[PDB]
Design a protein around this motif. Structure first.
Motif, PDB file in Angstrom:
ATOM      1  N   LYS A 111      47.003  51.047  41.069  1.00 39.66           N
ATOM      2  CA  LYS A 111      45.815  51.692  40.486  1.00 39.66           C
ATOM      3  C   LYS A 111      44.578  50.956  40.949  1.00 39.66           C
ATOM      4  N   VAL A 112      43.529  51.703  41.256  1.00 41.44           N
ATOM      5  CA  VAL A 112      42.217  51.103  41.549  1.00 41.44           C
ATOM      6  C   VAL A 112      41.184  51.940  40.794  1.00 41.44           C
ATOM      7  N   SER A 113      40.079  51.355  40.458  1.00 45.97           N
ATOM      8  CA  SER A 113      39.004  52.097  39.759  1.00 45.97           C
ATOM      9  C   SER A 113      38.184  52.872  40.774  1.00 45.97           C
ATOM     10  N   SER A 114      37.335  53.745  40.238  1.00 50.61           N
ATOM     11  CA  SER A 114      36.622  54.760  41.040  1.00 50.61           C
ATOM     12  C   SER A 114      35.750  54.101  42.119  1.00 50.61           C
ATOM     13  N   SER A 115      35.156  52.962  41.838  1.00 48.81           N
ATOM     14  CA  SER A 115      34.248  52.308  42.807  1.00 48.81           C
ATOM     15  C   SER A 115      35.058  51.938  44.049  1.00 48.81           C
ATOM     16  N   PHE A 116      36.327  51.512  43.895  1.00 47.19           N
ATOM     17  CA  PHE A 116      37.137  51.194  45.072  1.00 47.19           C
ATOM     18  C   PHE A 116      37.487  52.448  45.817  1.00 47.19           C
ATOM     19  N   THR A 117      37.946  53.499  45.138  1.00 48.71           N
ATOM     20  CA  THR A 117      38.320  54.750  45.798  1.00 48.71           C
ATOM     21  C   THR A 117      37.159  55.294  46.626  1.00 48.71           C
ATOM     22  N   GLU A 118      35.980  55.206  46.067  1.00 49.34           N
ATOM     23  CA  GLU A 118      34.761  55.831  46.655  1.00 49.34           C
ATOM     24  C   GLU A 118      34.301  55.011  47.838  1.00 49.34           C
ATOM     25  N   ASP A 119      34.766  53.786  48.044  1.00 53.65           N
ATOM     26  CA  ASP A 119      34.355  52.973  49.203  1.00 53.65           C
ATOM     27  C   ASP A 119      35.461  53.002  50.256  1.00 53.65           C
ATOM     28  N   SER A 120      35.413  53.928  51.162  1.00 51.43           N
ATOM     29  CA  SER A 120      36.468  54.131  52.174  1.00 51.43           C
ATOM     30  C   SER A 120      36.569  52.981  53.174  1.00 51.43           C
ATOM     31  N   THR A 121      35.543  52.139  53.243  1.00 50.37           N
ATOM     32  CA  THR A 121      35.456  51.067  54.238  1.00 50.37           C
ATOM     33  C   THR A 121      36.169  49.811  53.804  1.00 50.37           C
ATOM     34  N   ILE A 122      36.507  49.656  52.546  1.00 51.36           N
ATOM     35  CA  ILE A 122      37.123  48.411  52.037  1.00 51.36           C
ATOM     36  C   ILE A 122      38.559  48.687  51.669  1.00 51.36           C
ATOM     37  N   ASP A 123      39.506  48.048  52.361  1.00 51.31           N
ATOM     38  CA  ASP A 123      40.943  48.269  52.160  1.00 51.31           C
ATOM     39  C   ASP A 123      41.546  47.321  51.174  1.00 51.31           C
ATOM     40  N   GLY A 124      40.755  46.428  50.588  1.00 51.31           N
ATOM     41  CA  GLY A 124      41.207  45.443  49.617  1.00 51.31           C
ATOM     42  C   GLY A 124      40.334  44.223  49.673  1.00 51.31           C
ATOM     43  N   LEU A 125      40.710  43.226  48.889  1.00 48.17           N
ATOM     44  CA  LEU A 125      39.948  41.972  48.724  1.00 48.17           C
ATOM     45  C   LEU A 125      40.817  40.809  49.161  1.00 48.17           C
ATOM     46  N   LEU A 126      40.190  39.783  49.683  1.00 49.06           N
ATOM     47  CA  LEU A 126      40.859  38.506  49.948  1.00 49.06           C
ATOM     48  C   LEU A 126      40.101  37.446  49.190  1.00 49.06           C
ATOM     49  N   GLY A 127      40.670  36.959  48.100  1.00 49.16           N
ATOM     50  CA  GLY A 127      39.994  35.997  47.239  1.00 49.16           C
ATOM     51  C   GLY A 127      40.034  34.590  47.810  1.00 49.16           C
ATOM     52  N   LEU A 128      38.892  33.912  47.690  1.00 42.32           N
ATOM     53  CA  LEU A 128      38.688  32.559  48.216  1.00 42.32           C
ATOM     54  C   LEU A 128      38.121  31.629  47.174  1.00 42.32           C
ATOM     55  N   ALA A 129      38.122  32.001  45.907  1.00 43.47           N
ATOM     56  CA  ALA A 129      37.833  31.059  44.804  1.00 43.47           C
ATOM     57  C   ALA A 129      39.097  30.232  44.544  1.00 43.47           C
ATOM     58  N   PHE A 130      39.091  29.433  43.487  1.00 44.06           N
ATOM     59  CA  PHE A 130      40.223  28.516  43.251  1.00 44.06           C
ATOM     60  C   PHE A 130      41.408  29.305  42.683  1.00 44.06           C
ATOM     61  N   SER A 131      42.613  28.837  43.026  1.00 45.95           N
ATOM     62  CA  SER A 131      43.838  29.592  42.685  1.00 45.95           C
ATOM     63  C   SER A 131      44.073  29.654  41.196  1.00 45.95           C
ATOM     64  N   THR A 132      43.438  28.823  40.401  1.00 45.75           N
ATOM     65  CA  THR A 132      43.454  28.894  38.928  1.00 45.75           C
ATOM     66  C   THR A 132      43.011  30.237  38.417  1.00 45.75           C
ATOM     67  N   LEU A 133      42.209  31.002  39.185  1.00 52.09           N
ATOM     68  CA  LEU A 133      41.795  32.352  38.737  1.00 52.09           C
ATOM     69  C   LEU A 133      42.737  33.466  39.152  1.00 52.09           C
ATOM     70  N   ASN A 134      43.788  33.173  39.921  1.00 54.49           N
ATOM     71  CA  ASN A 134      44.667  34.242  40.398  1.00 54.49           C
ATOM     72  C   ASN A 134      45.351  34.959  39.230  1.00 54.49           C
ATOM     73  N   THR A 135      45.421  36.254  39.258  1.00 54.74           N
ATOM     74  CA  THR A 135      45.879  37.031  38.076  1.00 54.74           C
ATOM     75  C   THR A 135      47.375  37.310  38.116  1.00 54.74           C
ATOM     76  N   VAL A 136      48.132  36.888  39.098  1.00 52.64           N
ATOM     77  CA  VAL A 136      49.556  37.262  39.115  1.00 52.64           C
ATOM     78  C   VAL A 136      50.299  36.606  37.944  1.00 52.64           C
ATOM     79  N   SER A 137      51.110  37.427  37.285  1.00 52.97           N
ATOM     80  CA  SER A 137      51.927  37.038  36.130  1.00 52.97           C
ATOM     81  C   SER A 137      53.361  37.460  36.430  1.00 52.97           C
ATOM     82  N   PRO A 138      54.368  36.675  35.990  1.00 53.14           N
ATOM     83  CA  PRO A 138      54.248  35.456  35.207  1.00 53.14           C
ATOM     84  C   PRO A 138      54.062  34.180  35.985  1.00 53.14           C
ATOM     85  N   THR A 139      54.084  34.271  37.311  1.00 49.34           N
ATOM     86  CA  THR A 139      53.996  33.120  38.200  1.00 49.34           C
ATOM     87  C   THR A 139      52.694  33.270  38.976  1.00 49.34           C
ATOM     88  N   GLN A 140      51.686  32.468  38.667  1.00 43.89           N
ATOM     89  CA  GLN A 140      50.393  32.534  39.349  1.00 43.89           C
ATOM     90  C   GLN A 140      50.607  32.185  40.809  1.00 43.89           C
TER      91      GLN A 140
END
Length: 330
Positions: A111-140
């Motif tokens: 699932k993605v929200s409407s702002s992502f769907t409406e932006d055809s040029t962006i195929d996803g994100l690559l996060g470069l902040a600290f891994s403490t913010l990563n949202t994967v559960s149950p294993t970050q």
């Protein structure tokens, strides 16, 4: 090892920048938004709800000989603009600019929200902040940078964003040809998981520099510069006819204006943002009101040195044991 990839504005305003990323075997190249304000690498995929895909290139794990389901893992993220995405997780080989990580968590959007769907040029994100913010559960999971770090020649990456032009993300080395003068390094707090630092002050146009501490984050995934209301008011007071518009969603100004520069401090050094960089064009097609590139951080709860600020500098994200940021003019 090192990597070096070109990053390209998605449109004529520099609203965001996309960088090609190779995922899987054989490679599937997706154009991702490198985001130093988040810590998830997620993609449009063969799993994304079909009505939420409109022109993006998708990752298809079933076509990658190196993709593995990370069984039981899910992710779900909300960004500062109210956008969101969620899904499940694969591990796969990911390469950026010739630098390869095996076993990278690739978060597949269901699932993605409407702002992502409406932006055809962006195929996803690559996060470069600290891994403490990563949202994967149950294993970050770790970021691409955190997984690459030990292999890099130097535990760093650099952002060299262009004004209405391509720029570069480099991993593992500092291109001494890409900036002028010297790099000024400043302390980072990782307490909130961001590249959080304290600017030493600001100036508007040719005005006096105001020495004042401004905590904020270096965020390549945010378009604009968000600063305290006092600072922002002082900037827009120098532009004839500028005003804050609750209808539009911040400061606007006559398209006939010439904007002053904005200077921010990095230690004893100064980075100057040309006035042109602060122009985000008509508020709607054909309007003579233009949207400002410096906006109040009131109600966001943090100051954000987004692309308007970062593109004026060569920026070093130093991921050594004690992280630091560096800024140079260019």
């Amino acid at each position: 090892s090192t990597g070096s990839a070109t990053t390209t504005p998605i449109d004529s305003l520099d609203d965001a920048y996309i960088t090609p990323v190779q995922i899987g075997t054989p490679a599937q190249t997706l154009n991702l938004d490198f985001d130093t304000g988040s810590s998830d690498l997620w993609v449009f995929s063969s799993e994304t709800t079909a009505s939420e895909v409109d022109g993006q290139t998708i990752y298809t794990p079933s076509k990658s000989t190196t993709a593995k389901l990370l069984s039981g893992a899910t992710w779900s993220i909300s960004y500062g603009d109210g956008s969101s995405s969620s899904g499940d997780v694969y591990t796969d080989t990911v390469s950026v600019g010739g630098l390869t990580v095996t076993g990278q968590a690739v978060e597949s959007a269901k699932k993605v929200s409407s702002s992502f769907t409406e932006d055809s040029t962006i195929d996803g994100l690559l996060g470069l902040a600290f891994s403490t913010l990563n949202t994967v559960s149950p294993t970050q999971q770790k970021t691409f940078f955190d997984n690459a770090k030990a292999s890099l020649d130097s535990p760093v990456f650099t952002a060299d964003l262009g004004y209405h032009a391509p720029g570069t993300y480099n991993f593992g080395f500092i291109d001494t040809t890409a900036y002028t003068g010297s790099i000024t390094y400043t302390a980072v707090s990782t307490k909130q998981g961001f590249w959080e630092w304290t600017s030493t002050g600001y100036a508007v146009g040719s005005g006096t520099f105001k020495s004042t501490s401004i905590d904020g984050i270096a965020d390549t995934g945010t378009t604009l510069l968000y600063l305290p209301a006092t600072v922002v008011s002082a900037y827009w007071a120098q532009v004839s006819g500028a005003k804050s518009s609750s209808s539009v969603g911040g400061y606007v100004f006559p398209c006939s204006a010439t904007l002053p520069s904005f200077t921010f401090g990095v230690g004893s050094a100064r980075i100057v943002i040309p006035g042109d960089y602060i122009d985000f064009g008509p508020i709607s097609t054909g309007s003579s009101s233009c949207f400002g590139g410096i906006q109040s951080s009131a109600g966001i709860g943090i100051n954000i040195f987004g692309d308007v600020a970062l593109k004026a500098a060569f920026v070093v994200f130093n991921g050594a044991t004690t992280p630091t940021l560096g800024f140079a003019s260019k």
